[PDB]
From a paper:
EfAmi1 is composed by two domains: a N-terminal Zn2+-dependent N-acetylmuramoyl-l-alanine amidase-2 (NALAA-2) domain and a C-terminal domain with unknown structure and function. The amidase-2 family includes Zn2+-dependent NALAAs that cleave the amide bond between N-acetylmuramic acid and L-Ala in bacterial cell walls. EfAmi1 exhibits broad-spectrum activity against both Gram-positive and Gram-negative bacteria.
The results revealed that only the catalytic amidase-2 domain (aa 2–185) was crystallized and its 3D structure was determined at 1.97 Å resolution. The absence of the C-terminal domain from the resolved structure was due to protein degradation, as discussed in another section. Analysis of the resolved structure revealed the presence of a β-sheet bundle structure, comprising of five β-strands: β1 (amino acids 3–6), β2 (amino acids 23–28), β3 (amino acids 57–60), β4 (amino acids 63–66), β5 (amino acids 86–91). The bundle is framed by four large α-helices (α1, α4, α6, α7) and 3 smaller ones (α2, α3, α5). This secondary structure forms a characteristic cavity in the middle of the structure. The presence of a zinc ion (Zn2+) was observed inside the cavity, although no Zn2+ was added to the crystallization buffer. The zinc ion in EfAmi1 structure is coordinated by two histidines (His27, His132) and a cysteine residue (Cys140), which are highly conserved. The tetrahedral coordination sphere of zinc is completed by a chloride ion. However, Thr330 in LysGH15 contributes to catalytic activity as revealed by the finding that the Thr330Ala mutant demonstrates a 50% decreased activity. Therefore, Glu90 and Thr138 are predicted to be key residues in EfAmi1.
Residue numbers in the entry: 2 to 185
């Protein structure tokens, strides 16, 4: 997997105050490459970045760190979420091929495990969260369809949220506990 560190989000949200609390696994609900996502952010004004961005963008081949993890990111429309949780964007919409989406997901899980291990956090329901636990959204919609069978515009039910967390936790913990394991 190609690793690219390029902080195109320019630190506009400022440094995190306080400890890291966990990670949020997003889906872009687009079918663009991680590099296309990076270029899109690089071409925005700092005002346009106010619409939102994450710390990493991942596709089947690439992990791009678009914001240093010591900075906040405007990724969940919630102040404590934006301050305390690191955001991972997985390439994935309805058109993305299954195997491409699943590889992209694994790349994000591997990077999330690296960061949880670095900050010394456990891998559990406190530290692995979904965007819709912070604010109203269907995200992570493709993960929800693939792993929970939930393809809907209704607000994600609590039992499905827990199931999606547990899936994310199982994948992240596999990398967390096995530091030499690679996502490909
Ligand atoms: Cl999103
Ligand atoms: Cl904002
Ligand atoms: Cl397919
Ligand atoms: Cl909510
Ligand atoms: Na997006
Ligand atoms: Na934006
Ligand atoms: Na985004
Ligand atoms: Zn999201």
């Amino acid at each position: 997997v190609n690793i690219i560190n390029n902080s195109v989000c320019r630190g506009v949200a400022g440094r995190r105050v306080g400890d890291v609390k966990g990670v949020v696994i997003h889906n872009t609900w687009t079918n663009t490459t991680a590099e296309q996502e990076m270029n899109r952010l690089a071409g925005m004004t700092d005002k346009q970045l106010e619409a939102g961005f994450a710390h990493y963008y991942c596709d089947e081949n690439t992990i791009i760190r678009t914001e240093d993890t010591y900075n906040r990111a405007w990724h969940v429309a919630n102040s404590d979420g934006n301050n305390s949780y690191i955001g991972y964007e997985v390439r994935g919409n309805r058109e993305t091929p299954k195997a491409v989406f699943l590889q992209a997901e694994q790349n994000a899980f591997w990077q999330a495990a690296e960061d949880l291990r670095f900050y010394g956090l456990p891998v559990n329901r406190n530290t692995v969260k979904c965007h819709h636990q912070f604010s109203a959204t269907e995200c992570p919609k493709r993960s929800l369809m693939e792993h929970c069978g939930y393809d809907s515009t209704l607000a994600v039910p609590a039992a499905i949220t827990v199931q999606m967390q547990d899936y994310f936790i199982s994948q992240i913990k596999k990398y967390y506990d096995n530091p030499a394991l690679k996502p490909d």
